[PDB]
Amino acid sequence: ERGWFDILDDWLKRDRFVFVGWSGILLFPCAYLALGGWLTGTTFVTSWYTHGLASSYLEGCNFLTVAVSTPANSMGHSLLLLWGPEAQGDFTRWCQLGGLWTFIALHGAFGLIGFMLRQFEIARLVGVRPYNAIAFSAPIAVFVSVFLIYPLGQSSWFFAPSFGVAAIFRFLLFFQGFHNWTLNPFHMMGVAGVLGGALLCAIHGATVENTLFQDGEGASTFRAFNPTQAEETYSMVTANRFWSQIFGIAFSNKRWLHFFMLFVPVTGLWMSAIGVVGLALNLRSYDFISQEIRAAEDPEFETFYTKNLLLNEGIRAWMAPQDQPHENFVFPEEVLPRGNAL
Amino acid sequence: DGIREPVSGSLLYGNNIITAAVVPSSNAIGLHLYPIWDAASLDEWLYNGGPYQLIIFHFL
Amino acid sequence: MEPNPNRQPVELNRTSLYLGLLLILVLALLFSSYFFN
Amino acid sequence: MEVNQLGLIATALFVLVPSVFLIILYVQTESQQK
């Protein structure tokens, strides 16, 4: 009937400036700690003992080069809990060991669960279908595959992305040199979904804004709209004829159009996630075997595919000693691959 | 790259859809305009990456 | 036998045919290089 | 080029099986009473 659970439900679902909900009990602490952990680490915390890197404002980094970096490779996939066997409750040591990385990754994962639960919860209270939550499954698939599954397949959390601007750029280039990730058709489908999604965003926004009905006298046309109005604010019929004559095809069904705007980027991100799950195992699209057989036997045969592998080989040889310090690589000058002069 | 090191771009010359390309005109040409009628032959025009210039200028 | 009342007709309109064939053909254009390897 | 010999049948069926599925569904939609 009207017991403490229902009284709590009442208070959680009050219409207030920031809606809370049952999902908020998970979302707000985890989102706050993931964000607070990132700001704390990038402001004050080093990566000297895990990576041999400075990574905080305190050490002199700027917004582009600060990071919360992954733990050392010797930590393996340790949860690295503050009270765990590595830090043993020592907050300072925990920071030096990379404990803020798992802190942020794990509170971040549970925060993202909380956010998608929030999307379900609010949709149910307001009475709408939960397509926004469904679309959010693509961000979740990316986060889980890149920050959790990928390192879990590799030797340790060390090879996860570190949380920082330049750290992420390094992650991209590592994936080119070691995984040839641009060659992977699951990444290519990701690119198509992202660039196609951005294309749809731009073309739909521009089409609506340029097929508006004149619903007011102002030369600035934003005021000539009322949220409660029954009428479409732009002409689907004129938009359809325009694109039919420009491009050859056009939308004619507004419901399909808006579903497609969700489908394209959501599907692209999901495809990129599958490729990263493969790369967790080094199951790369690295080579074309027929290209390698021909090129090995025929020293005059050259394609852009063989050209890019040479670039990958330079990335690996020149970045690995400093990027993988636990390996203690010493590559004498004479073994480094390089072309003429450079 | 104008160093007499021709890069194969076409399907029939050993490429697949992922590796094939229409290859830029030679570094020896630089920014010079290289239309078909400035070449001694189509064979020359092809070696030096003539198709790329025709394509990109008409495309733009 | 007595008819099953749960049967429903199925439909695929022409636009859906064109969208689906485009998806299939483009996926094939994309993946075929990796099948030939 | 020494390509995989199953690439051809793989690509052919990858195209043909789902394409045929859609054509079957389309044609029987057209033939339904209008």
Binding site: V237, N240, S244, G248, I249, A250, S252 | L11, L12, N16, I17 | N13, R14, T15, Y18, L21, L22, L25, V26, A28, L29, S32, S33, F36 | M1, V3, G7, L8, T11, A12, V15
Partner: peptide
């Protein structure tokens, strides 16, 4: 064989463009 396959798929896509444009379902105002 692989070149034939690649060009065949491309050619089918171009044909599809032609039908999708000139033999589309006509948009009808209702």
């Amino acid at each position: 064989m692989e070149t034939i396959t690649y060009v065949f798929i491309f050619a089918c896509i171009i044909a599809l463009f032609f039908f999708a444009i000139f033999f589309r379902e006509p948009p009808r105002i209702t």
